[PDB]
Coordinates of C-alpha atoms in Angstrom, one line a residue:
Chain D
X1 CA 59.7 130.4 121.1
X2 CA 62.2 128.1 119.5
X3 CA 65.9 128.5 120.3
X4 CA 69.1 129.1 118.2
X5 CA 71.9 127.0 119.6
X6 CA 75.6 128.0 119.5
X7 CA 78.8 126.8 121.2
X8 CA 81.7 129.2 121.6
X9 CA 84.8 127.0 121.8
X10 CA 87.5 129.2 123.2
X11 CA 90.5 126.8 123.0
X12 CA 93.9 128.0 124.3
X13 CA 95.8 125.3 122.3
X14 CA 95.3 123.0 119.2
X15 CA 91.4 122.6 119.4
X16 CA 91.0 119.8 116.9
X17 CA 88.1 118.9 114.7
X18 CA 84.3 118.3 114.9
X19 CA 82.7 115.1 113.6
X20 CA 78.9 114.8 113.7
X21 CA 79.2 112.2 111.0
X22 CA 78.0 108.8 112.4
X23 CA 74.3 108.1 112.5
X24 CA 72.6 107.4 115.9
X25 CA 69.1 107.1 117.2
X26 CA 67.6 110.2 115.6
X27 CA 65.4 111.6 118.4
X28 CA 64.5 115.2 117.6
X29 CA 67.3 115.2 115.1
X30 CA 69.7 118.1 114.5
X31 CA 68.4 120.5 111.8
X32 CA 71.8 122.3 111.2
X33 CA 75.5 121.7 111.7
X34 CA 77.8 124.7 111.3
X35 CA 81.3 126.0 112.2
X36 CA 83.4 129.2 112.0
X37 CA 86.8 129.8 110.5
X38 CA 87.7 132.2 113.3
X39 CA 91.0 132.1 115.2
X40 CA 90.4 132.4 119.0
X41 CA 86.7 131.3 119.1
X42 CA 86.0 128.4 116.8
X43 CA 82.3 128.8 117.4
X44 CA 79.7 126.2 116.2
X45 CA 76.1 126.7 115.3
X46 CA 73.2 124.2 115.3
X47 CA 69.9 125.9 114.9
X48 CA 67.6 123.0 116.0
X49 CA 64.2 122.9 117.7
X50 CA 62.9 121.2 120.8
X51 CA 59.7 121.1 122.9
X52 CA 60.6 122.0 126.5
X53 CA 63.4 124.5 127.1
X54 CA 63.5 124.1 130.9
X55 CA 66.2 121.5 131.6
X56 CA 69.0 122.8 129.4
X57 CA 72.5 121.5 129.8
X58 CA 75.6 120.7 127.8
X59 CA 77.5 117.5 128.9
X60 CA 81.0 117.4 127.4
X61 CA 83.3 114.4 127.9
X62 CA 83.3 110.6 127.7
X63 CA 79.9 108.9 128.1
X64 CA 81.2 105.3 128.3
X65 CA 84.0 106.1 130.8
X66 CA 81.7 108.3 133.0
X67 CA 83.6 111.6 132.8
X68 CA 81.3 114.4 131.7
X69 CA 80.8 118.0 132.8
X70 CA 77.7 120.1 133.1
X71 CA 77.6 123.5 131.4
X72 CA 74.6 125.9 131.8
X73 CA 73.7 128.1 128.8
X74 CA 73.8 131.8 128.0
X75 CA 70.3 132.9 127.2
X76 CA 69.3 135.9 125.1
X77 CA 65.7 137.1 124.4
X78 CA 65.4 139.3 121.3
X79 CA 61.6 139.0 120.6
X80 CA 62.1 136.6 117.7
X81 CA 63.3 133.3 119.3
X82 CA 65.7 132.1 122.0
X83 CA 69.5 132.5 121.8
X84 CA 71.3 129.8 123.8
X85 CA 75.1 130.2 123.7
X86 CA 77.2 128.0 126.0
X87 CA 80.9 129.0 126.2
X88 CA 83.2 126.0 126.5
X89 CA 86.8 126.8 127.5
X90 CA 89.8 124.5 127.0
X91 CA 92.1 125.4 129.8
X92 CA 89.7 125.2 132.8
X93 CA 88.6 121.7 131.8
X94 CA 88.9 119.1 134.5
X95 CA 92.3 117.4 134.7
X96 CA 90.9 113.9 134.3
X97 CA 89.1 114.8 131.1
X98 CA 92.4 115.9 129.6
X99 CA 94.6 113.1 131.0
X100 CA 92.3 110.3 129.9
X101 CA 91.8 111.7 126.4
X102 CA 95.5 112.2 126.0
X103 CA 96.4 108.7 127.1
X104 CA 93.6 106.8 125.3
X105 CA 92.4 108.0 121.9
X106 CA 88.7 108.6 122.2
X107 CA 86.7 111.5 120.8
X108 CA 85.3 113.9 123.4
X109 CA 81.6 113.8 122.8
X110 CA 79.1 116.7 123.3
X111 CA 75.5 116.1 124.4
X112 CA 72.7 118.6 124.7
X113 CA 69.7 118.1 127.0
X114 CA 66.5 120.1 126.5
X115 CA 63.6 118.7 128.5
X116 CA 61.0 119.3 131.2
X117 CA 58.3 117.4 133.1
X118 CA 55.2 118.5 131.2
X119 CA 56.3 117.1 127.8
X120 CA 55.3 113.6 126.6
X121 CA 57.8 110.8 126.2
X122 CA 60.3 111.2 123.3
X123 CA 59.4 114.9 122.9
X124 CA 62.6 116.0 124.7
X125 CA 66.2 116.2 123.4
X126 CA 69.1 113.9 124.4
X127 CA 71.4 113.3 121.5
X128 CA 75.0 113.5 120.3
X129 CA 76.3 116.8 119.0
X130 CA 80.0 116.6 118.0
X131 CA 83.2 114.7 118.7
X132 CA 86.2 116.9 119.4
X133 CA 89.6 115.2 119.0
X134 CA 92.6 116.3 121.1
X135 CA 95.9 117.2 119.5
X136 CA 98.4 118.7 121.9
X137 CA 100.5 116.5 124.1
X138 CA 99.9 118.5 127.3
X139 CA 99.5 115.7 129.8
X140 CA 101.6 115.4 133.0
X141 CA 102.8 111.8 133.6
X142 CA 102.4 112.0 137.4
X143 CA 99.0 113.4 138.4
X144 CA 96.0 112.3 140.5
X145 CA 94.2 110.8 137.5
Chain Z
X1 CA 77.2 101.2 159.4
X2 CA 74.1 101.5 157.2
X3 CA 72.7 105.0 156.7
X4 CA 69.6 106.3 155.0
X5 CA 68.7 110.0 154.3
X6 CA 66.0 111.0 151.9
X7 CA 65.0 114.6 150.9
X8 CA 63.0 115.9 153.8
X9 CA 64.4 113.3 156.2
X10 CA 68.1 114.1 156.2
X11 CA 69.7 114.5 159.7
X12 CA 72.7 116.7 160.5
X13 CA 74.9 114.3 162.5
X14 CA 74.7 111.7 159.7
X15 CA 75.5 114.4 157.1
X16 CA 78.5 115.6 159.1
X17 CA 79.8 112.1 159.7
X18 CA 79.5 111.4 155.9
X19 CA 81.3 114.7 155.2
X20 CA 84.1 113.4 157.4
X21 CA 84.2 110.3 155.1
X22 CA 84.4 112.3 151.9
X23 CA 80.7 111.8 151.0
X24 CA 78.6 114.9 150.6
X25 CA 74.8 114.2 150.4
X26 CA 72.3 116.8 149.2
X27 CA 70.6 118.8 152.0
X28 CA 67.0 118.9 152.9
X29 CA 64.7 120.2 150.1
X30 CA 66.8 119.0 147.2
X31 CA 65.3 116.1 145.1
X32 CA 66.4 114.1 142.1
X33 CA 64.5 114.6 138.8
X34 CA 64.8 112.6 135.6
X35 CA 62.5 113.3 132.7
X36 CA 63.8 110.6 130.3
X37 CA 62.6 107.9 132.7
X38 CA 60.3 104.9 132.0
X39 CA 58.4 105.9 135.2
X40 CA 56.3 109.1 135.5
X41 CA 55.1 108.3 139.0
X42 CA 58.3 107.6 140.9
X43 CA 62.1 107.4 140.4
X44 CA 63.3 104.1 138.8
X45 CA 66.8 103.1 137.7
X46 CA 67.8 100.1 135.7
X47 CA 70.7 97.8 136.5
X48 CA 72.8 99.5 133.8
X49 CA 74.1 102.0 136.4
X50 CA 75.6 99.3 138.7
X51 CA 79.2 100.3 139.3
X52 CA 80.8 97.4 141.2
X53 CA 80.4 93.7 140.3
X54 CA 81.9 92.6 143.6
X55 CA 78.9 94.1 145.5
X56 CA 76.0 93.3 143.2
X57 CA 75.7 92.6 139.5
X58 CA 72.3 91.2 138.3
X59 CA 72.5 88.1 136.2
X60 CA 69.6 89.4 134.2
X61 CA 68.4 93.0 133.7
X62 CA 66.2 94.6 136.3
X63 CA 65.1 98.0 137.6
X64 CA 64.8 99.4 141.1
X65 CA 62.2 101.8 142.6
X66 CA 63.6 104.8 144.4
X67 CA 60.9 107.5 144.5
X68 CA 61.8 110.8 146.1
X69 CA 65.6 110.3 146.5
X70 CA 68.8 112.3 146.9
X71 CA 72.3 112.2 145.5
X72 CA 75.8 112.7 146.9
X73 CA 79.2 114.0 145.7
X74 CA 82.3 111.9 146.2
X75 CA 86.0 112.6 146.6
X76 CA 88.9 110.7 145.1
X77 CA 89.7 108.5 148.0
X78 CA 90.9 104.9 147.9
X79 CA 88.2 103.9 150.5
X80 CA 85.1 105.1 148.6
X81 CA 83.1 102.5 146.7
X82 CA 80.5 103.9 144.3
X83 CA 77.7 101.4 144.0
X84 CA 74.8 103.0 142.1
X85 CA 74.9 106.5 140.5
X86 CA 72.1 108.7 139.1
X87 CA 71.0 108.4 135.5
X88 CA 72.8 110.5 132.9
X89 CA 69.8 112.8 132.3
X90 CA 69.0 113.3 136.0
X91 CA 69.6 116.5 137.9
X92 CA 69.1 118.0 141.4
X93 CA 66.2 120.3 141.8
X94 CA 66.0 122.6 144.8
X95 CA 62.9 124.3 146.2
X96 CA 65.0 127.4 146.7
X97 CA 67.5 129.1 144.4
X98 CA 70.4 126.9 145.3
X99 CA 72.8 125.9 142.5
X100 CA 72.1 122.4 141.4
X101 CA 73.8 120.0 143.8
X102 CA 74.5 117.3 141.2
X103 CA 74.2 116.7 137.5
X104 CA 74.3 113.5 135.5
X105 CA 76.7 110.7 136.4
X106 CA 78.3 112.8 139.2
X107 CA 75.4 112.0 141.5
Chain L
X1 CA 111.6 134.2 176.2
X2 CA 109.1 131.7 175.0
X3 CA 105.3 132.2 175.4
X4 CA 102.6 129.4 175.1
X5 CA 101.3 131.1 172.0
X6 CA 104.6 130.7 170.2
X7 CA 104.7 126.9 169.7
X8 CA 102.0 125.5 167.3
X9 CA 100.8 122.0 167.8
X10 CA 102.0 118.7 166.2
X11 CA 99.4 116.7 164.2
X12 CA 101.6 114.0 162.7
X13 CA 103.9 113.0 165.7
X14 CA 103.4 112.0 169.3
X15 CA 105.8 112.5 172.2
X16 CA 106.8 109.1 173.6
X17 CA 109.6 110.1 175.9
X18 CA 111.3 113.1 177.5
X19 CA 114.4 112.8 179.7
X20 CA 114.4 114.2 183.2
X21 CA 116.2 117.4 182.3
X22 CA 114.5 117.6 178.9
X23 CA 117.7 117.0 177.0
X24 CA 116.5 114.2 174.8
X25 CA 113.0 114.0 173.4
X26 CA 111.7 111.0 171.4
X27 CA 108.6 111.3 169.2
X28 CA 106.8 108.6 167.3
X29 CA 105.2 109.0 163.8
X30 CA 101.5 108.4 164.2
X31 CA 99.7 105.9 161.9
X32 CA 97.6 107.3 159.1
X33 CA 93.8 107.7 159.3
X34 CA 91.6 104.8 158.4
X35 CA 89.1 107.1 156.6
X36 CA 91.9 108.9 154.6
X37 CA 91.5 112.3 156.2
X38 CA 94.6 114.3 156.6
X39 CA 96.1 114.3 160.1
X40 CA 95.9 118.1 160.0
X41 CA 92.1 117.9 159.6
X42 CA 91.8 115.4 162.4
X43 CA 93.8 117.8 164.6
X44 CA 91.6 120.7 163.6
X45 CA 88.5 118.6 164.3
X46 CA 89.8 117.9 167.8
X47 CA 90.8 121.5 168.5
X48 CA 87.5 123.1 167.4
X49 CA 83.9 123.0 168.5
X50 CA 81.6 125.6 167.0
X51 CA 77.8 125.8 167.2
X52 CA 77.4 127.3 163.8
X53 CA 79.8 124.8 162.2
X54 CA 79.5 126.1 158.6
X55 CA 77.2 127.0 155.7
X56 CA 75.2 124.6 153.5
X57 CA 77.0 125.7 150.2
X58 CA 79.0 123.2 148.1
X59 CA 82.4 121.7 147.9
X60 CA 84.8 122.8 145.1
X61 CA 86.0 119.3 144.5
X62 CA 86.9 118.0 141.1
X63 CA 85.5 115.3 138.9
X64 CA 85.3 111.8 140.4
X65 CA 87.7 109.4 138.7

């Protein structure tokens, strides 16, 4: 059973904009890129396919600077396919991920891992989803960051 | 001091002493797994994950064999020196139902 | 009236001198911990020995910077 992926972005302030524009190593490439004009939840959809839906995680942050989180998904079984929705909040985000992004302009990248042991090499998913850009100046000038 | 504690061979006094230092290793029964690895037999890590050139930075690329290994969480202390972290796609698997100890670069 | 359960302990200062009639008391600020632990937690560590020290669970610490 393939999965339908979605990301509910429940920002509390100026969210920003997605940008899956640049081309990278296309390993199990993304079949769909979507969005939503909603107000409180700027949900995104990417109905892709993978091989092994055991290791399933959403790493959001800066890969080169080594500040990334780990978000588990919200699974739904209807009888058709899998429904994997991971709800990312803005406010609860770690302080460093906000302070660094605020001080240094770099797009917060999103990565999705779908994998397991049984699959053969290169059959599992590890790729770049989107790049959020921060807008609001909420960044304390004296913090442990 | 030099300490070693692998899954299945982790003491309690060493774990407590490291907890007093701000280093929290995974307990017994928790192991590191990485599927996007060039090694299917054991755990292997390249020199890309070296984190301090004043301890060791390889003049040319290399990879280190680790096998069944563990990971630790660190605090924001001036005295802690991270040397080698877990691969980005790695994760902690527990035999029981324990929430994953670590995940990605935070191990 | 003062009871030995009224006065809590000092974890950041050390008594170095008390006059003969207790009129003048001189304390000295202790040096900070080499490991970086708070002096409060060194004090608690000294004042507490429990067989079942605590559960396995996990720290609620934030992201390493």
